[PDB]
UniProtKB/TrEMBL annotation, chain A:
Name of the featured protein: Bacteriophage Mu GpT domain-containing protein
Domain of life assignment: Viruses
Disulfide cysteine pairs (residue numbers): 79-166
Domain Bacteriophage Mu GpT, residue spans: 1-252
Coverage span on the entire protein: 52 to 304 of 304
TrEMBL record, chain C:
Name this polypeptide is given: Bacteriophage Mu GpT domain-containing protein
Residues of the full protein shown: 255 to 304 of 304
Length: 253, 50, 50, 51
């Protein structure tokens, strides 16, 4: 960002910019299953050859596993700045900022708040190669003649999970998400306001607009009372009703 | 096959600019709390009748 | 991999029919609040239970 | 289900799949009622007959 405006006194202080870079390399993946000729050719029941479609759906489901495992491990993997994606010591010019809250008493499951409105989303994924498959169902195969048979069915995929700004995301607050009060409202509005109160390199607000709340299946009820209930226990409004849309996923924890 | 890891291992990359302008800045708001009065000299003196 | 399970039916005997309908079937809990468990599971009342 | 994807390090790791089986046998039931010939064959009001 361009340096902030300054009051003209004496000469000028010629400043410098700050270019940033992120590097990430593709990885190779494969799942392979081997069977025998006698097994399949003696399978008169026909409940042994859905291998093709099972393998196809495994390949289709791989990206979900990759992305959500990365989301789980965000507290361990590093973002561009140099710290963990979810860390308490994200650096600003002289300042230190934290995007992960704990309790050291009750930390079981972590909800996640993701402002996906921006052009670049969170925990992005890169697709270098689509899926490709192969079989061993002809006599001339080396595997077909290596033993009785090795009728392998495998997958080939080049992928790796990616991430983005580790300040636009706040995805670790394992304190609590639901109670009569102070867990239903405090720890959620806390994340919302902390994300809306971020400061950029230079001294300008980030303009964060949290819109997605991601929780495991176990915290969905807490998330739904936090957002999705119009009235309140005492008959009043829920000030956070319809504040952010919640999504329930079973690929985390 | 064999090659120095400072030429191929360095140039086997594709630069992309997705990260550019990913985030934004707080929108302008001073209009809702202030009027714009242009000035043509060092200072402006204001005077109104009681 | 996760299993997709979507509960849609709650089976209770006659004696628990009132409790089941109160849990799911009432829109206002105590002070006009909203029942989070309204119209998510359909209750089945059968006398062939306990 | 098919095994999950694995990072490529050296050689393909040939995996195994599994199948499951369940079985149950039928059972025979009955309900029996005994009535007296003279009791029902003399029934003139039709009390018996919905049997």
């Amino acid at each position: 960002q361009f340096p902030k405006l300054r009051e003209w006194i004496g000469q000028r202080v010629i400043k410098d910019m700050a270019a940033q870079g992120y590097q990430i390399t593709n990885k190779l993946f494969e799942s392979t299953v081997g069977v025998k000729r006698t097994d399949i050719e003696d399978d008169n029941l026909g409940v042994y050859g859905p291998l093709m479609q099972e393998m196809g759906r495994a390949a289709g489901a791989h990206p979900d596993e990759l992305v959500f495992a990365l989301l789980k491990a965000g507290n361990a993997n590093l973002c561009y700045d140099g710290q963990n994606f979810f860390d308490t010591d994200h650096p600003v010019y002289p300042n230190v900022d934290g995007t992960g809250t704990a309790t050291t008493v009750s930390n079981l499951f972590a909800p996640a708040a993701d402002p996906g409105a921006a052009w670049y989303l969170l925990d992005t994924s890169r697709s270098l190669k689509p899926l490709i498959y192969q079989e061993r169902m002809k006599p001339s195969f080396t595997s077909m003649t290596k033993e009785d048979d090795e009728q392998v069915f495998m997958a080939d995929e080049y992928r790796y999970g990616v991430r983005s700004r580790c300040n636009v995301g706040f995805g670790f607050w394992q304190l609590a998400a639901m109670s009569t009060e102070e867990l239903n409202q405090v720890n959620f509005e806390k994340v919302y306001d902390a994300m809306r109160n971020q400061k950029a390199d230079g001294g300008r607000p980030l303009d964060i607009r949290p819109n997605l709340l991601v929780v495991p299946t176990t915290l969905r009820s807490k998330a739904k009372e936090v957002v999705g209930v119009q009235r309140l226990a005492n008959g009043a409004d829920n000030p956070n009703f319809e504040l952010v849309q919640v999504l329930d996923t079973a690929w985390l924890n | 096959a064999i090659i120095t890891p400072a030429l191929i291992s360095a140039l086997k990359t594709s630069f992309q600019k997705h990260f550019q302008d990913a985030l934004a800045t707080a929108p302008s708001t001073y209009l809702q709390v202030a009027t714009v009065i242009p000035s043509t000299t060092a200072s402006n003196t204001y005077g109104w009748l009681g």
